[PDB]
Amino acid sequence: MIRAVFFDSLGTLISVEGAYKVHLKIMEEVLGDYPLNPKTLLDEYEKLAREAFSNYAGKPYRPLRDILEEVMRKLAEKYGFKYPENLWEISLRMAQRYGELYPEVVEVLKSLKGKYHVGVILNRDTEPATAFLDALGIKDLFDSITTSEEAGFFKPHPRIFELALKKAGVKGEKAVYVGDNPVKDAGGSKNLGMTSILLDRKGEKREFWDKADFIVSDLREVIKIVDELNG
Ligand SMILES: [Mg+2]
Ligand SMILES: [Mg+2]
């Protein structure tokens, strides 16, 4: 029986397009009048952050603030603009102003509440991530919020999923995990016995669909999967 449904954040609850806008607005603020295209700075940021962060996948937790500050330091040195003071605060303000949920999120979360444990798992620092969920208006819709800072390891290390399950009080066999990353989300959660749902909104990850138990393009399909699993 499925008693718990856990959600990834970025690309699952939190819009990738909204995240791009957030990040572009950060770059615009950082640069000011510096004669660099903010979109080009953003493109370079995304490359470095992907690589720097891929080195931490499954590894012991390190504050993401520190990792991203080091990326920005490299970018400032590369392009010649002054390293921005209070970068973290700029980023938090931009995320609260421009971050966006996918349109079905509130409905889906509310539909599961009262029948299942509703959880979110964030590969992030706890205070900023929780304040962002609060700004988007959904912090209190969750029975549990679990983070890499709490578990001590980044996805797909099993500890973050183990902790989420403990908060819900069930073993993995009783839970579903929905995420958009085949290896870090589907593979990671399967390692604890969870039922993995790969969210492929644009149908662009077919070559990785066999890494998950179910594939969906819209979070409204999740409750139908859970209902069927429960008879
Ligand atoms: Mg994601
Ligand atoms: Mg995350």
Residue numbers in the entry: 1 to 231
Paper's wording?
MBH reactions are valuable carbon-carbon bond forming transformations in organic synthesis, for which no natural enzymes are known. Previous work has afforded the MBHase BH32.1413 which promotes catalysis via a histidine nucleophile.
In contrast to the improved hydrolytic activity observed upon His23MeHis substitution in BH3220, MBH activity was reduced upon MeHis incorporation across all BH32 variants. Of the modified variants tested, BH32.8 His23MeHis (subsequently referred to as BHMeHis1.0) was found to have the highest activity and was selected for further engineering. BHMeHis1.0 was also found to have an altered pH optimum compared to BH32.8, with the highest conversion observed at pH 6.0. To gain insights into this mechanism, crystal structures of apo-BHMeHis1.0 and apo-BHMeHis1.8 were solved. Efforts to obtain structures complexed with either substrate(s) or product have thus far been unsuccessful. The MeHis nucleophile adopts a single conformation in the structures of BHMeHis1.8 and BHMeHis1.0, however a notable 120° rotation of the imidazole ring has occurred. The first four mutations introduced into BHMeHis1.0 during rounds 1 and 2 of evolution gave a > 4-fold increase in activity. In contrast, these mutations reduce activity in the analogous His23 containing variant (BH32.8), and therefore would not have been selected if evolving with His23 as the catalytic nucleophile.
